[PDB]
């Protein structure tokens, strides 16, 4: 499949809104599923710095290609305006959207 450019008011339920450049300074992408390695996504590769996770949701980003690197979970909404500490802003790696549910 592929990601869908053009976000809405606010992402929720396993929904995450990416934003080229940090501090939402650039186009915005809407992903309500899974998106690893965004090099050939048609307008997205490299452009990945500020992101916003919806509430009642759990976004897990995996530093480096989703195949290797590291993984982290983010319950409830969240605002990652900058990802330089994660791995140089822009070109994050992979982002997954999963709601909270019994183990």
């Amino acid at each position: 499949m592929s990601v869908c450019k053009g976000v809405s008011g606010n992402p929720a339920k396993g929904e995450v809104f990416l934003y080229k450049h940090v501090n939402f300074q650039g186009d915005s992408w809407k992903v309500t599923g899974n998106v690893y390695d965004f090099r050939s996504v048609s307008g997205l590769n490299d452009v990945v710095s500020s992101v916003k996770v919806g509430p009642n949701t759990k976004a897990f980003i995996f530093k480096d290609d989703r195949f290797n690197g590291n993984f982290i979970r983010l319950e409830e909404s969240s605002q990652v305006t900058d990802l330089t500490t994660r791995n140089l802003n822009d070109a994050i790696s992979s982002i997954i959207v999963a709601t909270f549910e019994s183990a």
Side-chain angles (χ1 to χ4, degrees), residues 29-90:
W29 268 256
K30 167 270 222 84
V31 206
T32 82
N34 311 134
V35 167
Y36 38 82
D37 258 326
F38 35 72
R39 61 182 160 159
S40 339
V41 173
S42 342
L44 186 48
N45 66 308
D46 227 21
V47 290
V48 224
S49 263
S50 55
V51 202
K52 306 193 72 225
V53 181
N56 229 272
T57 296
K58 227 205 206 166
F60 316 48
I61 62 176
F62 297 67
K63 163 168 138 188
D64 243 42
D65 297 69
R66 186 242 143 134
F67 231 45
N68 258 322
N70 195 261
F71 70 77
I72 59 170
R73 36 169 167 222
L74 279 144
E75 70 176 50
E76 74 162 300
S77 68
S78 60
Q79 217 225 281
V80 171
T81 158
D82 253 63
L83 287 157
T84 35
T85 75
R86 182 89 329 252
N87 169 7
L88 229 103
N89 36 234
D90 275 336

